[PDB]
């Protein structure tokens, strides 16, 4: 038997599926998602790091002008600077006062600290959509674990279950991520070889082990003064740095739906967007046939209390004459009422009870057990607790076509208020069909 | 200076822009695709592979029944015979017939052989194109290999590129697609865990390496013929078989646009799909002042010959002038005519020739020669042959390109027609301006 249906897109909260398979006796299967994973395809752009500057030291030519040719590393300076006397602590280094230079050269290549502190720049593309299922099935406790795109059908105890497609492609991932360590950023990095000098990707890689460097540092040679024999410069401070102190918060903070952000790999966990449609395949052996089942007749429903409230605040007892010995499924009659409770034992002619949550200020509702129906209804007080920290188990919220009992004060008025019209109008009517009749 | 045009994405075609940039010589840079290619990310859903039927010696009870065990093993079936009275080269097996029973049982592995032959499922989500290009620039030939995504910069000869984004994201690649060896096929692959018998995925692991195997081979075992102890069966023949017997024509073969399809990696070489814009950070030393420029008077152009062949079978000599020795940059002023040179040397009094190819029946044109234009015209006329080899050099001409200067036929004739009706018309406004002056 293929049994198809759709829930919310929600974690840690289980629904209530009722299988209906004529001539057998009705099955509730109670699913819930434990954990819900979009994985995005990534495609590395490029690594940033901090840069190293490196300065060999500075050559004088004492007697005559030092010169340096162009050389290909990544961002190479060579300076000469004249009219230089520099000194030593065992005095005057360079004999000729005149005709003296120093001949300055640096160039800057990725640090060997790239290999453990870097940020990867990233492309996404789509995402990989699975999901953790517990399923209710045959009294069981049955983890089932399958992608959530329509695909990679699994099968448990026989019963095979299709996950998705998803309804909703959304991703909490932009098309350009950064990725720190266990921090993702929805970050617009600049363009590979086109980096800026001070801002995050100045220097790059394509890979950490790769020799080929990009570098924008505006790395400037001074002139040395004073006698003194250094190799002064003014270079923009690393944007790997700057960045770090300024990353602001990741996605695991700041994405919506309450989106979990992990990474190694990047994965969006447990988003509450859209709606989840599984397929499970039953076998007919997973069915009792309803001449083997109990019967219950002479049903009656009470109802000892009702809040109003999330966490099952109402209880209900009904009471059954069981017939048969055995066991069957319980199901509400309605979407306003959930009932905890899948299935009851039933013997003899004891009553059972069971738990709902409704959002009804009344709460009128039937309950189908063993193929059979009765009819609830009670007036349900409202909490006192004005928060709690578990995410609501009743269906939804009241709505302009539900209301609260004793709301016949609205069908009084109305019904009042078009007296009054119907009146008025048959006044009407009689007065023009005479006035019709004259001539 | 930068410099921004768009090219048809046509592989092997060269074309030429005119980069104008005020107070200097006009430049003209040459740019051809060498090559397109389209790689798709892929994600690996499964490997199929042809299925070995693994079937151990059979048990025989000789006086007494045999039962079954149930085995996890990926295809397992086991049934009992009984009235089995199997023979060995000796005799029979045993003295006892009538209670003689024989057990048979068998299951499906995945074959060693599927380490090198199997298809492997996947599906496709993006990809990510790059180019090489080749450019003339300065002189000299160039090649610029880049990523077409518009994110990628490439320096060479101090000039920074920046190739795309691709104006269309089309692809010969659908969603999901199996590839063989080097054949790539577009096919909606069955969902893994779902196979059917005798067809393509019946038998599928995640990895060539898993120990983790789904079958659906429809194994049945039957009884053995008499006097024997072989253990018969209907089953599928592997659909992996069957497919690569059925596969059909390749991608490679079939895809639109002239794509060339490649395995290991994946990918699309030379798709003629849209275009590809390019941009050009062009040094200030790559640019020569108009003062520096030789300046060209007096010329006029003079056309020899021309057959709109599309193989620059056109030729034009011009006459000019120089102020002094050096070279001057060559652009065609329409789109109908396509100039071979990028540039040409000037010296004294001299003339110069260049090829060019259109597909004008009247080939007139203005070209720029260096500081200044000329005007050319000629009758062109047809090849000879019907096909040739090669893509045309010229573009494709509208309505009014066509038109030869034959056409004056037209003009004569409209012009004829406007007169009848301009005449028509003036004789009918006199005699309305004469009857309402008349009354």
Redesign the interface.
Known sequence: YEHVTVIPNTVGVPYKTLVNRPGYSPMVLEMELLSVTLEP?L?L?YITCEYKTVIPSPYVKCCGTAECKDKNLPDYSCKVFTGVYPFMWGGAYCFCDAENTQLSEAHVEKSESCKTEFASAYRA??A?ASAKLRVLYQGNNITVTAYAN??????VKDA?F?VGPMSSAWTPFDNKIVVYKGDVYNMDYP????GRPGQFGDIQSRTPESKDVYANTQLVLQRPAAGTVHVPYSQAPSGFKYWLKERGASLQHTAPFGCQIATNPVRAVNCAVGNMPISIDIPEAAFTRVVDAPSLTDMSCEVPACTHSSDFGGVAVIKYAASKKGKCAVHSMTNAVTIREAEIEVEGNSQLQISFSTALASAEFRVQVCSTQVHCAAECHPPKDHIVNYPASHTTLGVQDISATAMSWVQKITGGVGLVVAVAALILIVVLCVSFSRH
Chains 1, 2 share one sequence.
Do not use: L, N
């Open positions: 395809t495609s752009d593309h789509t990989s329509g695909d990679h059908a699994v099968t095979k299709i363009p590979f070889g086109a």
